[PDB]
Each structure stands twice: as C-alpha cells, then as structure tokens.
Amino acid sequence: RSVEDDKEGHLVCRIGDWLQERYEIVGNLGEGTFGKVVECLDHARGKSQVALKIIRNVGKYREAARLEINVLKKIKEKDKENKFLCVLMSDWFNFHGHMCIAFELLGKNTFEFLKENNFQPYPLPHVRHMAYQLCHALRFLHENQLTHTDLKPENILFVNSEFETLYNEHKSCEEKSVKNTSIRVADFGSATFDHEHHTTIVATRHYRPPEVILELGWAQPCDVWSIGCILFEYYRGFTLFQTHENREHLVMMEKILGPIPSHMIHRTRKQKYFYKGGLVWDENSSDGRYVKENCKPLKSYMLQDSLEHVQLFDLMRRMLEFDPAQRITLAEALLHPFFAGLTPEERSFHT
Numbered sequence: 001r002s003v004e005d006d007k008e009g010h011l012v013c014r015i016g017d018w019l020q021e022r023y024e025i026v027g028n029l030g031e032g033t034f035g036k037v038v039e040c041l042d043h044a045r046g047k048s049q050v051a052l053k054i055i056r057n058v059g060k061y062r063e064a065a066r067l068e069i070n071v072l073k074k075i076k077e078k079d080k081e082n083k084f085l086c087v088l089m090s091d092w093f094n095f096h097g098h099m100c101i102a103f104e105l106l107g108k109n110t111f112e113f114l115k116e117n118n119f120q121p122y123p124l125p126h127v128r129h130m131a132y133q134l135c136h137a138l139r140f141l142h143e144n145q146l147t148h149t150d151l152k153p154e155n156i157l158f159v160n161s162e163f164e165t166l167y168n169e170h171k172s173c174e175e176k177s178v179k180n181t182s183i184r185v186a187d188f189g190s191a192t193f194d195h196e197h198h199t200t201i202v203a204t205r206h207y208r209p210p211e212v213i214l215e216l217g218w219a220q221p222c223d224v225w226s227i228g229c230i231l232f233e234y235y236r237g238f239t240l241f242q243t244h245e246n247r248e249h250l251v252m253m254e255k256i257l258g259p260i261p262s263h264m265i266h267r268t269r270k271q272k273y274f275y276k277g278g279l280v281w282d283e284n285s286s287d288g289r290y291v292k293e294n295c296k297p298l299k300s301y302m303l304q305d306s307l308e309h310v311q312l313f314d315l316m317r318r319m320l321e322f323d324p325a326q327r328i329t330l331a332e333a334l335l336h337p338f339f340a341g342l343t344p345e346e347r348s349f350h351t
C-alpha cells in the first residue's frame with residue numbers, strides 16, 4: 001500500500017499498519033496543528049505500549065520536530081535515570097517526510113481531563129500534588145540551564161487518568177476525580193538553553209509573562225509565571241487571563257495583581273501601552289468593558305478561607321510577581337509551607 005497524506009500534510013493512518021517494521025498502530029489518541037498522536041505496540045520490545053507523535057509532512061514542522069528531537073537527546077543525557085518527571089523519547093525516525101517520535105504511553109492531559117469533567121476544578125489536595133511535581137520537574141531543567149517556554153495544561157499529562165465518579169457535595173451534578181495525581185511534563189520543542197538564541201516572543205498567550213509582552217528579555221522566570229497561571233486554572237477550572245491581545249492582557253494583569261512596577265515601564269520600548277506613566281486603554285470598548293466586568297483582585301478567587309487555601313494563594317501571588325528578578329524561583333517554591341500538606345507518599349514520589 002502507498003503512503004498517503006491529506007490536504008494539510010497529515011499522514012493517513014490505519015489501524016493494523018506498521019512503521020519501521022516495528023510499530024503496529026492500535027489506536028488514535030489525538031490531533032493538533034503539528035500532526036497526530038497514535039497509540040502503537042512496539043514489536044521489537046515485547047509489544048510494549050507507545051504513543052507515537054507523527055508530524056505533518058510540511059517543511060517547517062519537520063524542522064521543528066528535528067529541533068525537539070535534539071532537545072530531547074540533551075535532556076536524557078542529564079537525566080539518564082529518568083527521575084525528574086519529563087516525557088523523554090525512546091526512538092525517532094523520518095517516515096517518508098513525517099518525523100515520528102516515540103514516547104511512553106500516558107493518560108489524558110490535564111486540560112482534557114478538566115474539559116471531560118465539564119470544567120469543574122481539581123480539589124485542593126490534587127492541585128497541591130500537581131504543583132509539587134511541576135516545581136520539581138522544572139527546577140531540574142532550570143538548574144541545567146534550560147527554560148521550557150511553553151508550559152500549559154495541555155502538555156502536562158497524567159500517568160494514568162482513570163477516575164471515580166462521585167456526586168458533587170454542593171451541586172446538582174456528578175464529578176470525576178482522578179485516582180492517581182502523578183503527572184509528567186511534555187513538549188520540549190521550544191525549550192531553550194541559556195546559550196542559545198532567545199526569540200522576542202515566547203509562550204502561549206494566556207501563559208505569557210509581562211517581561212515578554214514588554215520585550216524586556218526572558219529566562220527561567222518565564223516558566224514560573226506560566227506555573228502560577230496553570231495552578232489557578234486547575235483550582236478554578238477557568239483561565240486566569242482569557243485574552244487575545246497585549247493591551248488587554250496588561251490591563252487584566254493590573255486589575256488582578258496590582259500596578260505594573262514603574263521601573264519596568266521606564267525600561268520598555270513598548271511605550272504604546274502607556275500614557276503619563278500608566279496603562280492607557282479604552283474603557284468603553286468591548287475589551288475594556290469585558291475586563292472591567294470580569295477581572296477582579298487575585299484573592300477574590302479563593303473558594304475557602306482555611307489555611308491551605310490562603311497558602312496556595314500566597315504561593316500563586318509570588319509566582320505571579322511582575323518583576324522576573326523578584327519572582328519566586330522553583331527552588332524557593334519547594335520550600336513554601338503550602339507543601340506541608342502533602343502526604344508522605346506524595347512528598348517522596350511513591351505515587
């Protein structure tokens with residue numbers, strides 16, 4: 001049989017087909033703008049379960065996948081024992097122009113799980129365990145001169161997303177609760193070493209920090225901001241910054257977190273956002289009215305008053321510091337009293 005691609009360059013994939021005389025396709029897991037993810041059995045390794053990312057046959061995506069492969073090689077060199085919760089590759093190949101990367105088979109991503117639960121948030125103890133693991137994984141990359149740059153709920157995955165279905169204590173509906181909150185961090189193709197070229201703009205918009213908007217440069221603190229935003233989303237089930245545009249995004253940041261520091265305003269070449277030393281914006285526009293109605297101070301979003309909620313919000317505010325130099329590092333984050341709530345099993349990574 002011929003190899004066929006669709007009009008967007010995606011491989012046409014058939015259950016029962018083999019690649020590299022080795023990988024038997026057994027299921028489709030998902031599709032995005034990069035290509036597809038499929039579940040395979042690896043017949044050269046005892047029919048082990050694999051997730052294969054199959055990249056579209058389009059030059060720019062091919063080049064981006066070759067970059068991801070080269071990053072993944074370096075990460076494995078630094079973590080040969082695979083102890084720091086990253087999704088590392090087990091093989092890669094070019095299949096008729098489609099780059100394919102083989103990974104361990106995981107559960108649903110944390111966005112998909114949230115969506116399939118009708119956006120009902122994760123319980124605080126789940127949020128706390130996921131937070132601990134994220135800070136752990138990223139702390140190791142940061143200590144090895146790497147920044148991920150594109151952290152978001154979709155590239156954090158449960159090891160196993162099996163769940164119990166419970167009736168909601170206080171609402172007229174059912175809720176899904178994950179049985180095991182062990183997670184892994186994926187998607188390293190944008191990850192950048194300290195010595196390598198830093199593009200002006202990084203991150204997905206909703207997760208993007210102010211220093212990047214203001215074109216002040218970026219480094220590892222970019223990831224901590226993204227983690228702050230992720231933890232809010234896990235806790236509430238909605239996006240902290242539901243924004244499509246820079247000026248709007250800045251206004252949201254001021255309404256939620258307080259004024260942007262004057263020293264950052266003085267330094268930015270993006271003076272279009274400012275007038276007389278303050279943000280300038282149209283309060284009567286569609287975006288202006290949306291932000292005035294919907295964006296409230298951070299502490300207003302707490303669901304309960306008890307100690308563990310107050311601690312989560314203290315940590316989150318520290319991760320969301322405007323000045324990246326002042327922002328909490330992951331090493332310090334791991335010392336925060338929010339993490340006193342972890343079970344021993346959670347703290348010692350025996351989940």
Ligand SMILES: COCCOc1ccc2cc1OCC(=O)N(C)CCCN(C)Cc1c[nH]c3ncnc(c13)N2
Binds near residue numbers: 029
């Ligand atoms: C299509 O709508 C919903 C389904 O979306 C997905 C299904 C399966 C996924 C990831 C999905 O969305 C996010 C996404 O594509 N990336 C972050 C890039 C690919 C990351 N993979 C390759 C990492 C990965 C490694 N072991 C895995 N075992 C199971 N699923 C995985 C992965 N990814």
